[PDB]
Amino acid sequence: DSLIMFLVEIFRSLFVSNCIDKNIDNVLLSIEEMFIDHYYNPQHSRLKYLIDDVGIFFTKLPITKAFHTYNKKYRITKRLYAPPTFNEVRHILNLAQILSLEEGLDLLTFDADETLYPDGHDFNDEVLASYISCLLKKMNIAIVTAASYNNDAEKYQKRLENLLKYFSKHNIKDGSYKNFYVMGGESNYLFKCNEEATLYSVPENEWRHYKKFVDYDTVQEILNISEKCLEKVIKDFGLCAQIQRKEKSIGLVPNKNYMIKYEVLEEAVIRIKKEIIKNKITAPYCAFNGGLWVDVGNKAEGLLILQKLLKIQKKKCCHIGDQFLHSDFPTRFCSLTLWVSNPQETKACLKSIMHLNIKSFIPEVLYENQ
Amino acid sequence: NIEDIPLGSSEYDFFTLSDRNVMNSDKNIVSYNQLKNKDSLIMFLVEIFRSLFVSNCIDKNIDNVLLSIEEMFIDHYYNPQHSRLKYLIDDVGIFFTKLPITKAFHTYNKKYRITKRLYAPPTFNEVRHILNLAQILSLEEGLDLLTFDADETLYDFNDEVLASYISCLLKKMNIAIVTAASYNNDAEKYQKRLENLLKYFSKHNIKDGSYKNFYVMGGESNYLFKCNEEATLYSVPENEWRHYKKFVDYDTVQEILNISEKCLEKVIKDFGLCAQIQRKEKSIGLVPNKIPNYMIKYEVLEEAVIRIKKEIIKNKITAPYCAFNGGQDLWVDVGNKAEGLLILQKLLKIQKKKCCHIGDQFLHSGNDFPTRFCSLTLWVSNPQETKACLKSIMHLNIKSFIPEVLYENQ
Amino acid sequence: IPLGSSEQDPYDFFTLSDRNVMNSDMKKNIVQWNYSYNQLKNKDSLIMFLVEIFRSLFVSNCIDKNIDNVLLSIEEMFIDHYYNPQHSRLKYLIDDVGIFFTKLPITKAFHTYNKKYRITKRLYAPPTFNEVRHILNLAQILSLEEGLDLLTFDADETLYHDFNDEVLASYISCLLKMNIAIVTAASYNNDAEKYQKRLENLLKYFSKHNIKDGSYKNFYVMGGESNYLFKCNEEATLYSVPENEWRHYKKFVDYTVQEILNISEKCLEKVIKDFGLCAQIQRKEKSIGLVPNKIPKNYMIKYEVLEEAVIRIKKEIIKNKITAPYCAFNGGQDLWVDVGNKAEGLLILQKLLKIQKKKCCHIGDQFLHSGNDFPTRFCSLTLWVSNPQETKACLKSIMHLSFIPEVLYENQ
Amino acid sequence: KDSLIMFLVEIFRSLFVSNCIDKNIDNVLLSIEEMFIDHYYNPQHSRLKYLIDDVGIFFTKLPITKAFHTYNKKYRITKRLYAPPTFNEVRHILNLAQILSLEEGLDLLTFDADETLYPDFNDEVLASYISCLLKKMNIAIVTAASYNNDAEKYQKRLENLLKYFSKHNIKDGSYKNFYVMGGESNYLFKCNEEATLYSVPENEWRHYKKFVDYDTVQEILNISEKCLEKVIKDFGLCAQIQRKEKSIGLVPNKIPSNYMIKYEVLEEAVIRIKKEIIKNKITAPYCAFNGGQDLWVDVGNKAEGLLILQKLLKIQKKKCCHIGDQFLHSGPTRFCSLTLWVSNPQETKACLKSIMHLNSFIPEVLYE
């Protein structure tokens, strides 16, 4: 809600000034030169001054070609009473990031909790599985999830079986199955795929040196502080819920199920962080309300581990998620992040990613089949 | 009559909260001015509880604050035009009953203990619950008519526990269904949408005379239907209830659709939409084509509504209508669900303190359906809330039952 | 004219109009810089509408380059609103914008202000509300290629106690050689001499410079907002213009006038008893006021109590169903309800002199009055000046209507 | 108190729109006073600190409930049906609670001269109160005007106040308790038997001040001088750069018979200065101030000077009270001593009259 709101008001002022359908190249190219200036000198840039929480530009964002591409198809400037909206600027920034990938991509990462199964149940989309299939032939595919199953690959495969079903038919002969990765526990458990389209655990020895270290005792007392507070949350609000503890995660689960108020869940999240602050713990963790789980580790550092493990340059990486569902350390600080809000947008970006170096193909981020 | 209800049939959310293609699931994360204009009475109470919370007194004795609010509510019930509440909030509505807002808060606070929170103040959704509680607690003498907004709270129908509650309440009061769907006077198509509800009526509502209390208002306020002993819908002739409705000349109805048709044809050209226009007897719509369905941008559909409203003002038309979106298509109806409610209580000769409407104000504008003007309204956002409110209505007068507006089994 | 004599503006917890607390020019601009967006937007919606446009151009880092395409598009809307004030696109975006009696060259006004003060060279301070108040004042002055026949001043806001500025008495004098009108809420019946005492040093200047060429006849004074008219004679002395002479240009209000005074008096008597005020009520033929008593100086009435009393009187006016035009103001230390309207007093002066509205200009400070009482740009072109330095700058530009118009600094 | 005043403004607004503020609101007020008392005991872990981050520290227990009753009984703002409490009335109530918390009196009373004493000093009734208060406490005046060691230049501004001391505060030796701190926190002065200012040697009080070396003080002025030099050329100013040893200023030139700089340019230049210093990794407390017509960046701050006079005169923080105007410097002294926010001379004399009667007199902070 920083860079998007930045352009939204700019377009709102061009709208009410009655010039947004005319030649706004002078305004667009000044913003683009701002973005190019920020890409070269990201510290003490002019964009940094206006938007202090702005990330790092790993690419040169062609925001002028992104607006012209979106406006030629959807004619948002021909609307007399409806200015450009939050979602249209978001589509334009997704359009600019895809257009900036002239070199191509070697690693494409997904947020499964938001992109592959936002419903909360196993993968289920053949067309989406087909896009991931053909993209796996050209690049590495990694999937990041907050599921807490420790290191048993059968539980993670249960959620992605419909996706691994498609790998069985087309992704075994050419050896592309070797490049598919799964990071469980946000950033603590890694899995790969074999010839039989089955997930197997990658031992820590093969990738532990790519993850920043956190003390075992530090991990535990994070869960200890989280445990006592949830116990008080149960007694304070008379909840019919139970605490489920794992090696690096602890959760507030309702008994089979019972409904916990969304506000009480948010209240519990604010008691946890505030308590961890009072004990002067500096280790990164992720207290998450799903409509509660406290994982030691976040999905952003999990994207970092995968970039080091595969030895990929920041330019050739792109992450796909839905920032509506979390409001968190932004994953945009570690990779190029597309923001998709429904499956039709996800299949639109994946189709344009399949045609990156092709000039005849126009980038689309909203309608897969239009 | 609809002349007394402030309709704004022809009168911006940069975040597009009402866009359900992007707002796909339970909404909770995201909105101040948007929630305020949907109901200024809720946000009026949200700001008062927030100050009591930040003054560190919301879990102590706040009866002094609640009772002065309740007295303002009682006074607004007695003189709704010159009351203090009418001055602080201008678009409140009419309190057809005295609202016991204090006991409604104690009831919600005793079960959910929202004042025990240290960091989350009472939210907009919780005050809406407390309001629904006050509306139900005010029904001390019962209900004679219960209206449902089918498009917002019922839809086809597929909920056996919901059908059972309606059947149980059908034995005690008139049940009316108001839908924006228009299938002319053919009750077959309306029967297909309410089939599982009518099939339940066949089993439990035929022997007693309860099936005679079921009404269906199609076309928002244009096509009325009743239920026979075979649990089958049949048209109530227009001549039977036409005098309960503000008369709109047939020449005015067609001209409204003619204005809407030419605006929509221009919207098709301006944006290259793969859509066509299907025209009904009293309604007209912009419908996306089927891909050899297509998609029209949510912002283009919102642009088309405003153009249609602005062109109707240019043509000096004061007839009530409802130009609205609906996610995927555009629809202009020469009809109004608020007048549809007024027709029903005039036909049934119901006094206003014995009527209750159930709808989801998130999915409609306050210009089309103004808040608290036809009857007392319940704002529900999910079926579990609907089931909880119906069971609470089912257990009126039953002192053993504590009214619940959020959780059915809890 | 969309008058809201009994309506009220949104409440201001910051009390910007409280002159006792906001008594420094340094205090005002700091609070203007922060706690002020809602009040400034209500004082003039077209200025704040332009502030947000430049703020977006500034933040996009293009305000230093060629922004003519934005400025000329804004100017086209001002021309279309001048040609169709009822259903202009500008009317849709700004409901309370008002009437443009002239074609405003807003592009040429921005250039003129920017080339002298270089507000565009700033990197951290975008254009402010007061600078887009200045560019618009310049746009209205540049719009008078066909000049002015009448120039009106709000003496309560722009000239004064009594008139005391000979340099300001120099500008009006040579301007008097066009019609000059003085509008004042001060009510002294048809007593021509009591109005003289407050314009004493202005009229004494007229005696030395405006008698020979006969310019003294074109000077007018509207007293009681719109109740008592005065002219100037050969001896620089005000004399009463009989009400019979001009009353047909004014909306007739039934001698209804007395009932407004009875309503306000009874409300102010309750106000005194409610807050234990050491004040009395003074009643004139067409006005009534709450004045504090003398200290056995004079006592002090709270600004908020004066605010409460104003709202009460206007609500009591509504419940009595009186729709006659009037003005109840706060006045800082004393309250006054007058059966008259300065905006109506301007229309009388325009009708009395039969002058086109394109040839009329008004000088006043909108910080000191409400828009429901004097609507924006509905009687004539209006210049919003904040201190005598801006008044002399604007008057000097009107004099030389080689000269580059200046509205901010008299010398510079 | 900008954050604390709006805290109560918003709470009294809800009591207004709930129709209960004229009724008995003792439960709401004493719930607030309990939060204030808990903050006085544990300021770092208080509920109030979570609500207001910049609340600071309360050196006294605030009787905000008694302050509300006192203000409302005389002015009856709860009888207003349409004008809820304003920012100023809560500010008046916050001044009442602080004066009411001084049960044991004051040993030091401090004045910001630029904000509350300069309408040169010309007010006899104000000079009469200061003379009376000097007979029972230490009176300190803090000024941003820096004339270095030269006491004759400072005395010009306080002449009519010092000449009032000459006729009343000399026989009892009250002049020995009058102090002047020029340069914000750099030049201390005292008064002698002739009602005349004399400078105090810095060696005698420098140990009460955090030390900044000639190397650091000068670099503040070097960066400011070059940023101000760019500003004069950027906007074509007819102004000069006046450099002193501990301050440097942008001063407009006089007219041929002074010129005026746009307030936005003076604000544009302060921001350029501050952001350039941060680029140079300087963390020393300086004060870049706008002041309407001329810019001044002084090495030092008025708050540091209040701490200097506290340690020098051996004054407990409960016995200190500062009088200033925070409308003029909202770009805080509340962290060093009890601070009253006054906006006009009548408020100053009202608050001062209440301080003379700290030990039947109902406190007043509005009209004397």
Question: Key features?
Answer:
homotetramer, 370 residues, alpha/beta, Rossmann fold, 12 helices, 42% helix, globular
In short:
Four copies of one chain form a homotetramer. Chain A has 370 residues and is α/β, with parallel strands linked by helices. Chain A is built from twelve helices and eleven strands.
- What fraction of residues of chain A sit in β-strands? 5-15%
- CATH homologous superfamily (4th level) name of the largest domain in chain A: HAD superfamily/HAD-like
Order of helices and strands of chain A: HHHHHEHHEHEEEHEEHEEHEEH
Structural class of chain A: alpha/beta
Q: How far is the N terminus from the C terminus of chain A?
A: 28 Å
Rg of chain A (CA only): 22 Å
The largest sheet of chain A, given as strand count, sense and whether it forms a barrel, is: 7 strands, mixed
Work out the helix count of chain A.
12
Write down the overall geometry of chain A. Answer: globular
Largest interface: A-B, 42 and 45 residues
Assembly status: homotetramer
The CATH topology name of the largest domain in chain A reads Rossmann fold
Counted up, domains of chain A total 3
Q: Please tally the β strands of chain A and state the result.
A: 11
Helix percent band of chain A: 40-55%
**What CATH first level of the largest domain in chain A would be assigned?**
Alpha Beta
What's the CATH architecture name of the largest domain in chain A? 3-Layer(aba) Sandwich
Strand order of the largest sheet of chain A: 5-4-3-2-1-10-11
Binding site for ATP (chain D): 74, 92
Binding site for Mg(2+) (chain D): 112, 114, 325
GO molecular function (chain D): ATP binding; IMP 5'-nucleotidase activity; magnesium ion binding
Binding site for IMP (chain D): 112, 114, 143, 146, 247, 294, 302
